Amino acid sequence: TRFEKMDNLLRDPKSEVNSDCLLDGLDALVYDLDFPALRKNKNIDNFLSRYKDTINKIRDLRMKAEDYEVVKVIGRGAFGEVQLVRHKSTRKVYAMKLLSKFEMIKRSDSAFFWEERDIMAFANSPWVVQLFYAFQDDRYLYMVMEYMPGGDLVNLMSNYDVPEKWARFYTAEVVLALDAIHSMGFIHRDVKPDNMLLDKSGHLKLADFGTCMKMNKEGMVRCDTAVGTPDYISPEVLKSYYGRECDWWSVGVFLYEMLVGDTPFYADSLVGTYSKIMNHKNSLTFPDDNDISKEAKNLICAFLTDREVRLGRNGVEEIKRHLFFKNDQWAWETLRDTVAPVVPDLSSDIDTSNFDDLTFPIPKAFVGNQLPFVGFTYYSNRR
Amino acid sequence: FETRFEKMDNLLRDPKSEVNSDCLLDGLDALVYDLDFPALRKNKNIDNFLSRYKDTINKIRDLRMKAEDYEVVKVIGRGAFGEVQLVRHKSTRKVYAMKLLSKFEMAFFWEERDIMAFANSPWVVQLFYAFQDDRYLYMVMEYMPGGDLVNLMSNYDVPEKWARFYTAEVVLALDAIHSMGFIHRDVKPDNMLLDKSGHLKLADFGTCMKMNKEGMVRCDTAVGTPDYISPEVLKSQGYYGRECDWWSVGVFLYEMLVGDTPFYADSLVGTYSKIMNHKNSLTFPDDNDISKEAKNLICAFLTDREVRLGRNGVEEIKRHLFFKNDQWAWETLRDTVAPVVPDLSSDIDTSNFDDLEETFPIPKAFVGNQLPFVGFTYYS
Numbered sequence: 001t002r003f004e005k006m007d008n009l010l011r012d013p014k015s016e017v018n019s020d021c022l023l024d025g026l027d028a029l030v031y032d033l034d035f036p037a038l039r040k041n042k043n044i045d046n047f048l049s050r051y052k053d054t055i056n057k058i059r060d061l062r063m064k065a066e067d068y069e070v071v072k073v074i075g076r077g078a079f080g081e082v083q084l085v086r087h088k089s090t091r092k093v094y095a096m097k098l099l100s101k102f103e104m105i106k107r108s109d110s111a112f113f114w115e116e117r118d119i120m121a122f123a124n125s126p127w128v129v130q131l132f133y134a135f136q137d138d139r140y141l142y143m144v145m146e147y148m149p150g151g152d153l154v155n156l157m158s159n160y161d162v163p164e165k166w167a168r169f170y171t172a173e174v175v176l177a178l179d180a181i182h183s184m185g186f187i188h189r190d191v192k193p194d195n196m197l198l199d200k201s202g203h204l205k206l207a208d209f210g211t212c213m214k215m216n217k218e219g220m221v222r223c224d225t226a227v228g229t230p231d232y233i234s235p236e237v238l239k240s241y242y243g244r245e246c247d248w249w250s251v252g253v254f255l256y257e258m259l260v261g262d263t264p265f266y267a268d269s270l271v272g273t274y275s276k277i278m279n280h281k282n283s284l285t286f287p288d289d290n291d292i293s294k295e296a297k298n299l300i301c302a303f304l305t306d307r308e309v310r311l312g313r314n315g316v317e318e319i320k321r322h323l324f325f326k327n328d329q330w331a332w333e334t335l336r337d338t339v340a341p342v343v344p345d346l347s348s349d350i351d352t353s354n355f356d357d358l359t360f361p362i363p364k365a366f367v368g369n370q371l372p373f374v375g376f377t378y379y380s381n382r383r
Numbered sequence: 384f385e386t387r388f389e390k391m392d393n394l395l396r397d398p399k400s401e402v403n404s405d406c407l408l409d410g411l412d413a414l415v416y417d418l419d420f421p422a423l424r425k426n427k428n429i430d431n432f433l434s435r436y437k438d439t440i441n442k443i444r445d446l447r448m449k450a451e452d453y454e455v456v457k458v459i460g461r462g463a464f465g466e467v468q469l470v471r472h473k474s475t476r477k478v479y480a481m482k483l484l485s486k487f488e489m490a491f492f493w494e495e496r497d498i499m500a501f502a503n504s505p506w507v508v509q510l511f512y513a514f515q516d517d518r519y520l521y522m523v524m525e526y527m528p529g530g531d532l533v534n535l536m537s538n539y540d541v542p543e544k545w546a547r548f549y550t551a552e553v554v555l556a557l558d559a560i561h562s563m564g565f566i567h568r569d570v571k572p573d574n575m576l577l578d579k580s581g582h583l584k585l586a587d588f589g590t591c592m593k594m595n596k597e598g599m600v601r602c603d604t605a606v607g608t609p610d611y612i613s614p615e616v617l618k619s620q621g622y623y624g625r626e627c628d629w630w631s632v633g634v635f636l637y638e639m640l641v642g643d644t645p646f647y648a649d650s651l652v653g654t655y656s657k658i659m660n661h662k663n664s665l666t667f668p669d670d671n672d673i674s675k676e677a678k679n680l681i682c683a684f685l686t687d688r689e690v691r692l693g694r695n696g697v698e699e700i701k702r703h704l705f706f707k708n709d710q711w712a713w714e715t716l717r718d719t720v721a722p723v724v725p726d727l728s729s730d731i732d733t734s735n736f737d738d739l740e741e742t743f744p745i746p747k748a749f750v751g752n753q754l755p756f757v758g759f760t761y762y763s
């Protein structure tokens with residue numbers, strides 16, 4: 001009488017077939033059948049009519065988009081948008097990411113949303129933006145995260161001239177956030193200011209995990225295709241078996257851009273950037289007016305080098321030990337407790353002052369377009 | 384929100400709910416059966432979903448109730464879509480009567496499962512579990528070792544005092560079914576099972592239907608053996624209620640005291656005709672040993688629904704002169720000693736039961752064969 005194991009498999013928030021996954025299965029089934037063409041099947045019609053009432057009960061009882069008041073669209077992406085939302089009942093504020101099932105089916109080359117949900121739902125790090133709920137519908141996937149009112153690092157870099165002390169803080173927090181992600185067993189693969197967000201008290205948290213890959217037995221990744229951003233992509237990830245050190249190159253690019261005011265491998269043509277990155281040894285130069293310290297250019301150059309040579313090849317302590325990080329404000333351990341360079345000032349809980357103001361074809365035969373999303377919802381069984 | 388979260392959660396464990404985890408797991412293991420074929424694995428969605436949940440659902444299959452958790456002792460009954468077999472739970476070493484319905488050979492089973500599982504009456508055979516595999520639907524019940532009333536009528540020339548007891552028990556067991564919101568439609572001895580104390584419990588509910596707003600039923604489906612069926616259900620191709628189950632009772636009282644049904648005819652069509660012509664065909668034998676009281680109680684039930692004893696409620700029935708006796712009182716009837724009490728050898732004794740002794744076709748398109756059985760599973 002070991003029916004106990006059953007309930008565990010049905011209640012564990014990490015289980016492949018918990019209540020969330022079960023409820024998703026039925027929801028998907030009723031979605032992939034309710035088409036007049038398919039309803040010409042007696043087996044299909046009956047089930048549908050018998051389950052009609054309860055599926056409606058369930059759909060309205062479970063989480064859905066109409067439970068959220070959408071305040072403003074505070075972000076856009078390849079397959080959707082990030083909207084600042086307010087939960088009508090609970091009055092709480094969150095950033096909700098939307099993903100189009102149709103778009104992703106048509107253009108995405110991976111099931112990126114799975115590891116992204118899991119990094120945000122279980123990371124339990126002050127360096128990772130957390131997930132509260134994950135849900136879906138006929139059209140979209142939904143990710144309910146904590147709102148980061150201070151905006152991103154692209155906004156900060158534009159609004160201000162970043163001094164070395166400010167740069168030292170932001171670099172240092174990204175180093176800890178990346179060490180947290182590596183400790184969790186992933187490689188970021190796409191580190192950039194777009195993915196660096198700021199909290200109400202001005203501390204960094206990472207936010208786009210669409211390029212995260214689990215490391216193998218030797219902390220490595222076998223890849224055919226290149227992933228990331230044309231400016232911040234390391235020479236290895238571009239040429240396409242790499243390690244965590246790729247994320248550190250992107251940190252070099254991130255430091256260089258904050259101090260110099262432009263990316264180290266800029267080109268007028270987007271393709272010209274590629275040529276430049278490959279020629280990093282003869283394209284990495286600092287402007288004539290060299291106001292940047294000797295210690296700062298040192299860190300930059302110790303990262304903006306070949307995979308084998310790169311600082312952090314022999315662990316993160318090598319990075320922390322760099323002279324550039326020595327300062328009168330914080331120490332690595334006390335960093336997220338110290339005061340931030342830019343402490344914002346927010347009008348309300350919905351203050352968007354740091355953010356720029358902004359389907360599937362009906363089938364003939366059974367296709368099952370909701371089947372590759374079964375298991376996404378993180379509502380009934382969470383930790 | 385907190386209420387909407389809790390509703391959904393309470394729902395996942397409510398056994399009377401269409402979305403209890405067992406029903407949700409049903410739909411999932413059903414989706415795997417109905418899609419795991421070479422033709423359908425040519426669709427990346429279908430192929431990938433299957434690859435993803437194949438091994439974990441077969442893990443689920445292994446933990447959940449399966450037929451091979453039971454040792455099949457003897458086939459103690461047979462029916463139009465399977466058989467009733469005496470079974471013992473391999474672990475528990477406990478004995479049950481478990482009914483089988485063939486998926487391939489086959490909706491009627493929904494009301495049979497709910498009545499048995501949720502009646503909670505000493506008059507209804509209990510359903511402990513309801514499960515399923517690819518081919519059959521299993522229904523695990525409490526085993527009734529006294530056998531049916533067919534067997535009783537074979538081994539005795541049923542005396543009146545015995546007839547009265549068994550009649551009063553069908554009256555009470557039907558009223559319990561009536562109070563649950565169902566009409567039987569075809570209550571016959573084959574349905575009247577006897578327990579270790581020789582007391583009644585109704586058992587074949589495939590003929591049952593849920594009453595409407597005004598407490599009535601309408602049906603289009605074929606009748607079968609008309610013998611115990613009322614003229615109203617026979618007229619229906621049309622609404623009727625309560626009173627039809629009382630006609631059946633009157634047939635059963637006539638059988639016990641006369642040896643044959645009142646409208647028996649050599650043919651099915653011939654019987655039906657005698658039922659329609661009931662106010663001319665109903666005859667009492669030349670030298671019957673039937674009471675004045677028993678004869679009135681038959682005719683009262685064997686009349687048009689408009690003038691039938693029981694139209695105005697069960698108490699009109701209960702107050703009848705026939706039921707006047709010193710050996711029992713309606714409210715403590717099941718408490719008195721039954722006229723026939725089984726003398727059983729062991730837990731697997733089948734002395735009171737007669738001795739007793741095809742595939743889905745591999746398809747091209749999504750057929751969805753398992754879909755009508757989604758939600759059959761029930762535990763306790």
Ligand SMILES: O=C(NCc1cccc2c1OCCO2)c1ccc(-c2ccncc2)cc1
Pocket residue numbers: 074075076077078079080081082095097098099129145146147148149197207208209210
């Ligand atoms: O990853 C993000 N956007 C990328 C993105 C958005 C939509 C579709 C995408 C896509 O990327 C891959 C293609 O499909 C993202 C941006 C901002 C926040 C955020 C967090 C907290 N507070 C305010 C804002 C959270 C996430």
Ligand SMILES: O=C(NCc1cccc2c1OCCO2)c1ccc(-c2ccncc2)cc1
Pocket residue numbers: 459460461462463464465466467480482483484508524525526527528576586587588589
């Ligand atoms: O429903 C029954 N028989 C009818 C029948 C049996 C199988 C398949 C059928 C069918 O009818 C039409 C569909 O296919 C039934 C009879 C006896 C018991 C019983 C219970 C407890 N103890 C001993 C015996 C349980 C069930």
